[PDB]
């Protein structure tokens, strides 16, 4: 993984030694080249994962997440460079450094072969993310949002640390390859009930689980656009990725420990989809959409079947590109009208035609229109949940109805109707903004042609 | 209610005629029953007691509600009609032309020359319009949404731009 | 009930401006100032480019790729009726047995 770690580090000297007018050009160009070379990770085998060294490995689960992570850094740079234009030059370089350092922790987190190394990097992402939100957010509430983000994560992470060290003491290793062969079943006891909870609660908070999701509407709304892009696209997937790995060592106790959390998710998604129908803030609406989608990922991981793991992996990738695109779409409006209120600016399809096409395409992927990989993932999860219990089709079906209503409600309210008369600064969409939109949607729609590379290890 | 007794009776008359027309359909049948309905209104035209007049109006409304058409005729472009707001998607505010690229503006050199004159006329009149409104408005703001005309030569009626330059009813 | 004199005067002044505005929307003779830039033959190049070239590609694709793999194109086997002659083998399918030839 050094062929990605080292060049990712070299982005930092590149940004700091660039001419004052080339920091965005240079960093964007070279983060795209790193993104290109990440495709070499798709040398995957049917039986064996790609094991580079004692420290890092890649498999069909981590590979697509790595490719998404390295692709997002260029997109976060283009999204940021407009609202940071007036920023002091050295503070601009520091902002880029936080994004680069976040990428470095992410690509190592998704490939660390030992769970305690995963834990340290899993936790190291808090620092740059917290700094990005609190330093470069716009509102007063960004300070409170950082505190909620920090302590919701840590309240779950600290028990995980104790559990992992306990597992290493008793098993003798936390290397994930070793855990595949030395795993022993977990027999019922109050001691093991709390080992299970400590192994799963840190990842549930990151997803987030319904009930523990309050940090996300605050954090995903107060953050600058780049912060929201990474929070929705990747950082939420640390929870899903972590669960997918650690559930190996939790069987068969997951049989009955999953019930309270499946209930929170099945009912949670219907609750958080319904919330989106009455949201007045466009960014808040998108954030609550992420909770609804990640509820399916939680259920798919917990029921633990070959189809649900394929569906969970597809959903995580598809949601990352969609949710990131929606935040970017809403940001373009915000950079014009300086407000997140959804009803403020209406009938925008009349004033910004092409950008209304992106809104439509983003909305269709969100409501899981076939054969998008959003539908592929969402359908595979529904297939496996039906087998788990047929009655779940009722809750999945209702959520699919509600999701279409709020996806098209957001499209109709902002893009259709009559334009607001007094808003007269809707300038035509910039090339940067159009390209930023097409760099989400085009890769997302291309993956439909070859969906096997985003279905994970159980394909 | 801010409608006088006269305005309520006259409104009820028109509304009842339209609903009567929806029941009758055929023009000759409508003319016959529109005159009987007019005779009923003429029968109490001179009622002087306001108390008795109001009671007559109350009953007429109750009768109208009982006998109204469940699906009355609506003009296509009227609120509720099948063409209402059909062309709102084609109405683009004039300020959008300021963002046009120069190569787009070069296609209509004569149109944008006139447009500049209108924008010049808007700037040079704005101050007088504000001043006129200030000096004709009683303390504590206006009591009505009515606006004055221009009182001088060269003065434009205050707050005219968005009335004069509004989109055409059939823009495309 | 009609307009008041102030109301009438304001309407009069707006009307002059509105009609002048609408007049100025008319295009001049030269506008737009563009920058620099029988059926059988017309129908022939449509059939060529939209029917023949595609069917060439599709036939090539089906004949040398799709049909070289098993069970890609599966046909219902032909119906065989009494009295038919099989082309593959020349076998003659026996006729049906005699009816009561009842008619009405």
């Amino acid at each position: 993984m050094l062929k990605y770690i080292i060049p990712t580090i070299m982005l930092m000297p590149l940004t700091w030694l660039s001419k004052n007018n080339m920091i965005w050009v240079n960093s964007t160009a070279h983060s795209l080249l790193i993104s290109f070379t990440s495709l070499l990770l798709m040398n995957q085998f049917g039986d064996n994962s790609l094991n580079f060294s004692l420290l890092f490995f890649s498999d069909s689960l981590s590979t697509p997440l790595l490719i998404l992570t390295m692709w997002l850094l260029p997109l976060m740079l283009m999204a940021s460079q407009h609202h940071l234009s007036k920023e002091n030059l050295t503070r601009k370089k520091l902002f880029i450094t936080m994004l680069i350092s976040l990428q470095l922790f992410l690509i190592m987190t998704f490939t660390a072969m030992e769970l305690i190394l995963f834990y340290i990097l899993f936790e190291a992402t808090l620092v740059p993310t917290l700094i990005i939100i609190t330093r470069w957010g716009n509102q007063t509430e960004r300070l409170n949002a950082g505190l909620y983000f920090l302590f919701y994560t840590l309240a779950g992470s600290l028990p995980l640390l104790v559990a992992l060290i306990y597992i290493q003491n008793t098993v003798g290793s936390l290397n994930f390859l070793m855990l595949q062969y030395w795993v022993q079943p977990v027999h019922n006891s109050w001691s093991n009930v709390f080992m299970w909870l400590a192994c799963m609660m840190a990842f549930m908070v990151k997803m987030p689980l319904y009930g523990l999701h309050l940090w996300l509407p605050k954090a995903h709304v107060e953050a600058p656009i780049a912060g929201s892009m990474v929070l929705a696209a990747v950082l939420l997937k640390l929870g899903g990725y972590g669960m997918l790995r650690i559930t190996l060592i939790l069987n068969p106790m997951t049989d009955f420990m999953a019930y309270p959390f499946i209930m929170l998710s099945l009912w949670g998604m219907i609750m958080t989809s319904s919330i989106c129908l009455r949201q007045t803030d466009l960014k808040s609406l998108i954030a609550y959409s992420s909770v609804s989608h990640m509820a399916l990922v939680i259920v798919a991981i917990l029921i633990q079947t070959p189809w649900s793991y394929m569906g969970a992996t597809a959903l995580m990738i598809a949601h990352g590109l969609t949710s990131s695109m929606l935040f970017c779409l809403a940001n373009s409006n915000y950079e014009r009208i300086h407000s997140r209120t959804m009803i403020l600016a209406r009938g925008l399809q009349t004033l910004l035609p092409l950008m209304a096409t992106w809104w439509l395409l983003a909305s269709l992927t969100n409501l899981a229109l076939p054969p998008t990989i959003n539908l592929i993932g969402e359908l595979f999860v529904v297939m496996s949940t039906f087998s788990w219990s047929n009655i779940t089709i009722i809750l999945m079906g209702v959520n699919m109805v509600i999701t279409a209503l709020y996806s098209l409600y957001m499209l109709i309210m902002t893009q259709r109707g009559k334009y607001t008369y007094h808003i007269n600064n809707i300038s035509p969409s910039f090339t940067r903004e159009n390209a930023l939109m097409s760099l989400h949607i085009l890769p997302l729609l291309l993956l439909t042609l070859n969906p096997k590379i985003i279905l994970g290890p159980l394909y | 209610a801010y409608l006088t007794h006269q305005q309520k009776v006259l409104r009820l008359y028109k509304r009842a005629l339209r609903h009567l027309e929806s029941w009758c359909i055929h023009r000759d049948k409508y003319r016959y029953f529109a005159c009987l309905l007019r005779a009923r209104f003429d029968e109490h035209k001179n009622e002087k007691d306001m108390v008795k007049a109001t009671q007559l109006l109350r009953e007429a409304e109750e009768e109208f509600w009982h006998g109204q058409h469940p699906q009355p005729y609506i003009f296509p472009e009227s609120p509720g009609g099948t063409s209402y707001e059909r062309y709102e998607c084609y109405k683009v505010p004039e300020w959008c032309l300021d963002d046009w690229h120069p190569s787009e503006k070069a296609m209509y050199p004569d149109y944008f020359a006139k447009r500049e004159q209108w924008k010049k006329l808007r700037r040079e009149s704005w101050e007088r319009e504000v001043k006129q409104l200030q000096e004709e408005t009683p303390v504590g703001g206006p009591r009505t949404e009515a606006l004055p005309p221009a009182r001088k030569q060269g003065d434009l009626p205050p707050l005219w731009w968005h009335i004069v330059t509004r989109p055409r009813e059939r823009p495309m | 009930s009609g307009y008041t004199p102030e109301e009438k005067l304001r309407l009069q002044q707006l009307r002059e401006l509105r009609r002048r505005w609408l007049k100025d929307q008319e295009l001049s003779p030269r506008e737009p100032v563009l920058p620099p830039q029988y059926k059988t033959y017309r129908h022939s190049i449509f059939a060529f480019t939209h029917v023949l070239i595609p069917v060439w590609i599709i036939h090539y694709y089906l004949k040398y790729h799709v049909t070289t793999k098993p069970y890609t194109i599966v046909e219902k086997k032909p119906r065989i009726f009494p009295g038919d002659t099989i082309l593959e083998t020349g076998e003659v399918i026996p006729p049906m047995k005699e009816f009561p030839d009842q008619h009405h």
Binding site: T350, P353 | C96, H101 | -
Partner: peptide, 12 residues
């Protein structure tokens, strides 16, 4: 009479 059609800039 041909009238001017007001549209947002299509150039960009």
């Amino acid at each position: 009479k041909r009238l001017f059609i007001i549209k947002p800039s299509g150039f960009y």
